[PDB]
């Protein structure tokens, strides 16, 4: 486990090139997330 950047609690990875992409995030303490919903699914073949 690394440490957050000093004086920070996480890192936002901003989408830079991909126009349609949304952000990705990183935390360095597992206590900063709680798993609220467990989702069971299938990907669907396009028609």
């Amino acid at each position: 486990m690394a440490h957050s950047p000093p004086g920070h609690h996480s890192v936002t990875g901003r989408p830079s090139v991909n126009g349609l992409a949304l952000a990705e995030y990183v935390i360095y303490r597992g206590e900063q997330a709680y798993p609220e919903y467990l989702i069971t699914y299938q990907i669907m073949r396009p028609e």
């Binding site: 609690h9 900063q32 709680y34 989702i39």
Partner: protein
Amino acid sequence: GSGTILIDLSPDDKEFQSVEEEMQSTVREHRDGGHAGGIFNRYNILKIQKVCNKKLWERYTHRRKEVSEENHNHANERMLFHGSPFVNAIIHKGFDERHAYIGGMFGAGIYFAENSSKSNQYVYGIGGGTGCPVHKDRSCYICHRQLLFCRVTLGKSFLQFS
């Protein structure tokens, strides 16, 4: 006996429906053409369960208050997706450093996505691993998959352009 119970939600539940909506509406195409996580535009949602665990919840809210008070009373709390082969450990034991990616872009931490289809790429491991256990198919349309939709405290987030 981990303390964790899973409450099954009904498809009629307002709470099932808004979670499903967030799952479906944040699907996107990926620059690998579907290589890690498969080729799809939408999901078949089969089940949504609430994860209830009093210890892990108190562990989360205790850290939230720490972060909040270090950031003008602003936890910066989001709902984000997490896909991992360890989802079953995570829901029973909670998140810790075994769920961090030591080799990640932004360091050895735990990664979450706003795009459900992005988390979908790590359901079977780094890069989609070898795909589903049964068919070894990263684009399996048969085998059931699981994602977590999680409550995340970001606090003061370091902005990284990329």
